[PDB]
Amino acid sequence: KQQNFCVVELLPSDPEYNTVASKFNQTCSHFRIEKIERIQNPDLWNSYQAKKKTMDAKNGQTMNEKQLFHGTDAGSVPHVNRNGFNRSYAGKNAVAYGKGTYFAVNANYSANDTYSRPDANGRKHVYYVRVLTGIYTHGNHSLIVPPSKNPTDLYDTVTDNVHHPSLFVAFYDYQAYPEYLITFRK
Ligand SMILES: O=c1[nH]c2ccccc2c2ccccc12
Numbered sequence: 001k002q003q004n005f006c007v008v009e010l011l012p013s014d015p016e017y018n019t020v021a022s023k024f025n026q027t028c029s030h031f032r033i034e035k036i037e038r039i040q041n042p043d044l045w046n047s048y049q050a051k052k053k054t055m056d057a058k059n060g061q062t063m064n065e066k067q068l069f070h071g072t073d074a075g076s077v078p079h080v081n082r083n084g085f086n087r088s089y090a091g092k093n094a095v096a097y098g099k100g101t102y103f104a105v106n107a108n109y110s111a112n113d114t115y116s117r118p119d120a121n122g123r124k125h126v127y128y129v130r131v132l133t134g135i136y137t138h139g140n141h142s143l144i145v146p147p148s149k150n151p152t153d154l155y156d157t158v159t160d161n162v163h164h165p166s167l168f169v170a171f172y173d174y175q176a177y178p179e180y181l182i183t184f185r186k
Pocket residue numbers: 069070071072092093094102103104109110111115116167
């Protein structure tokens with residue numbers, strides 16, 4: 001119903017901190033991480049899992065979920081924490097591969113200042129998101145929904161390059177869960 005949330009900081013001593021920090025660092029180790037937080041939102045989580053369960057029935061043996069990054073402004077954080085990456089949020093994003101929410105394979109893509117805009121204290125914000133990418137195809141600028149696979153079987157997301165992906169564009173409510181917030185600076 002309400003999608004209230006709690007924010008919990010991971011301590012640098014926690015192995016969970018080190019795993020998440022490690023995924024970011026793979027391409028963003030030149031930045032200084034200041035905190036990693038888990039976003040605990042049970043309703044959003046339950047809606048996301050209900051949607052993963054539906055995709056896992058449909059796609060057979062596909063690994064439907066990936067852990068991807070998303071940079072945004074401090075201003076959007078409260079929105080994402082409560083709502084996830086909404087249909088309304090999708091107006092924030094770039095357009096080259098369609099009108100949806102964009103998620104990067106690598107964190108440096110997300111660390112770009114036009115995505116993870118530094119706030120008034122020079123701090124930048126990137127989520128490490130669980131995303132139900134499912135079965136994907138190429139995107140283009142004309143898209144607001146994923147294409148069908150044979151013009152009623154639809155693709156789940158689109159990407160910039162099916163074989164060597166750098167991004168994925170999700171179009172649906174509850175298709176991604178903003179699990180971790182990473183706060184950092186140059
Ligand atoms: O992390 C990203 N955040 C975004 C935020 C708003 C618009 C686009 C992007 C985006 C686009 C491509 C790859 C990553 C991102």
